[PDB]
Design a binder for this molecule. Sequence first.
Ligand code: DCP
Ligand code: CA
Ligand code: CA
Ligand code: CA
Length: 341
Amino acid sequence: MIVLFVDFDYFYAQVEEVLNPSLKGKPVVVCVFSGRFEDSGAVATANYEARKFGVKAGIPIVEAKKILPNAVYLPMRKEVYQQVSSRIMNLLREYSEKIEIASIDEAYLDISDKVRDYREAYNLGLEIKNKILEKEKITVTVGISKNKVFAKIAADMAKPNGIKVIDDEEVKRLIRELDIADVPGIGNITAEKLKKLGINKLVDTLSIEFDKLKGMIGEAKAKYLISLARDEYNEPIRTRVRKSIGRIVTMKRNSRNLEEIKPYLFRAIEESYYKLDKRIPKAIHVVAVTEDLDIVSRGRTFPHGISKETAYSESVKLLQKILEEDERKIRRIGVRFSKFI
DNA sequence: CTAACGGAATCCTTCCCCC
DNA sequence: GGGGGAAGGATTC
Ligand SMILES: Nc1ccn([C@H]2C[C@H](O)[C@@H](COP(=O)(O)OP(=O)(O)OP(=O)(O)O)O2)c(=O)n1
Ligand SMILES: [Ca+2]
Ligand SMILES: [Ca+2]
Ligand SMILES: [Ca+2]
């Protein structure tokens, strides 16, 4: 295979800068205001002018303002970014019909039938970058390799407005030398689980016994890392289908009172049903985020589609079920729909 | 009514019913 | 022994 991976640079911030070019050159921070108090919330992303000083995704807004009090702080306008993203994905369809849309700013392309070698795949990456910059004035990063995992790693290496090829020779070096925490799918809890086993590179998984690795990171991640270490990973590019749609809102104050939580729950249902847009779900899940930011969920699936009225009455019964079987106060309450007709 | 923090989505694992 | 579902967990954007 020859996989071409596209990753939009600082997407949310860059879209805001395209829509307001006076933002060019300044630190821009895209925020998710929870509404509980002034500047409560987290940073969705920031451009590289702000990211260079430690303002990155996930950190609290009030911590970003202690670092950069004079940066531009904009509220997240996800529907604007989604519509811009959808147009860029339509541009990517013109280069390969095997395309896998991974997220709002990521897409894999199987270009095995469109180029002969990596030099031609490289040139196709330039043509794709120039086409996106010409149509939407958005800079992206191209990663090219023999599978999806190393194509994404390639884009991570040359990230800010770049293009990078990891050939079969560098693939083997990375199996020996790339720190295993930088492999997609290995978070801190799985990484620290590899370290305590002594595994720091992919090649280490081939010397260890399988069950000693399986019995503690799981069968799937063990097979996944072993196949990568053997240079035998080759999952195909697949069209991804949205499997669930939901919405969770932060309440103004923690509560275990039914009548106080119900307005937030009903608002989450209305917005979730608007996002359904056609699509008839057969399962509904009420999801509560407790004081300690833990996640509790109670669900129910029907032999038929779920009307909005049925979603209303069933969510209350599922919410009562959460107050019964857990005693932590709820901080965020929401709903999720799945199993579409 | 401004309080040390968002919101959304996937896949995998554990437990349990069931054949 | 294993298919299949409910709920938690880990990951990532
Ligand atoms: N914890 C996070 C991480 C990301 N995002 C959003 C903001 C990003 O614009 C988009 C894609 O995130 P990336 O991981 O691709 O990061 P960026 O595109 O912002 O930066 P980079 O240019 O390094 O990819 O997802 C978010 O809401 N919350
Ligand atoms: Ca990106
Ligand atoms: Ca991305
Ligand atoms: Ca990691």
